Amino acid sequence: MEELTYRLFMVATVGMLAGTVFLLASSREVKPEHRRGVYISALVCGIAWYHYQKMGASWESGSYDTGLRYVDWVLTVPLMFVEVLAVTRKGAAYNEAVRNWGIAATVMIGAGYYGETSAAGSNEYWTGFVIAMATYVWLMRNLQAEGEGLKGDQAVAFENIKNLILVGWIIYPLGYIAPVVGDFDAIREVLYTIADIINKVGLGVLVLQMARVQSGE
Numbered sequence: 133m134e135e136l137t138y139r140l141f142m143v144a145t146v147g148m149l150a151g152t153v154f155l156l157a158s159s160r161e162v163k164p165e166h167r168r169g170v171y172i173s174a175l176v177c178g179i180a181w182y183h184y185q186k187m188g189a190s191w192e193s194g195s196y197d198t199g200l201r202y203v204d205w206v207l208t209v210p211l212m213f214v215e216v217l218a219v220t221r222k223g224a225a226y227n228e229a230v231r232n233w234g235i236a237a238t239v240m241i242g243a244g245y246y247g248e249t250s251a252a253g254s255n256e257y258w259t260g261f262v263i264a265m266a267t268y269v270w271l272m273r274n275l276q277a278e279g280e281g282l283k284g285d286q287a288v289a290f291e292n293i294k295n296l297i298l299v300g301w302i303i304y305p306l307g308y309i310a311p312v313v314g315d316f317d318a319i320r321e322v323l324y325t326i327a328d329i330i331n332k333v334g335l336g337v338l339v340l341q342m343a344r345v346q347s348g349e
């Protein structure tokens with residue numbers, strides 16, 4: 133439904149802003165040396181807040197720009213890896229992973245955009261899919277490895293961060309392939325919007341929880 137897609141854009145706008153202000157307000161409840169991930173988490177929700185306002189306006193206007201979603205992803209998806217690295221690493225090791233995982237995440241979204249902006253089932257579509265899927269798997273394997281050697285409450289807090297991404301991000305590549313299986317355009321927009329709220333606000337809340345554990349909570 134077209135009115136549903138629009139209503140969900142408005143629910144996402146409000147959920148993203150609620151997440152932004154929750155995370156900024158909660159940042160003071162954790163120690164300064166563990167705040168970086170909470171701040172980056174709030175920034176991700178704030179960018180998505182701005183983009184969901186623009187998507188809702190674009191939609192109601194009758195000129196829905198499918199590119200707004202990818203501008204949001206190319207910014208927020210690398211930052212989401214960064215907000216996780218901000219609680220698992222510091223110093224040189226953090227900067228190294230921010231560069232390496234951040235570039236990988238940008239390539240994944242860029243390959244997706246290359247494929248999305250072609251005829252469905254076209255060669256460009258499949259090139260995009262394979263390069264983005266390969267980078268996705270590479271990132272999910274890096275995330276699995278990031279947990280190795282963690283202990284006690286930090287191992288449990290990291291498991292939750294890792295599994296939100298592992299389970300919660302499957303919908304994105306699933307949605308991409310859907311249109312070659314049939315007509316799933318309207319449902320894909322709805323499911324991506326719900327997924328974005330859960331993934332972005334949920335990951336920020338779990339990064340906050342890791343930062344609380346690390347602060348001695």
Ligand SMILES: *C/C=C(C)/C=C/C=C(C)/C=C/C1=C(C)CCCC1(C)C
Pocket residue numbers: 205208209212240241243244245260261264265268301304305308328331332
């Ligand atoms: C806040 C938004 C998020 C976390 C969006 C995540 C999006 C992806 C993981 C997209 C992945 C894709 C592939 C793995 C292959 C097909 C192309 C994409 C870009 C849909």
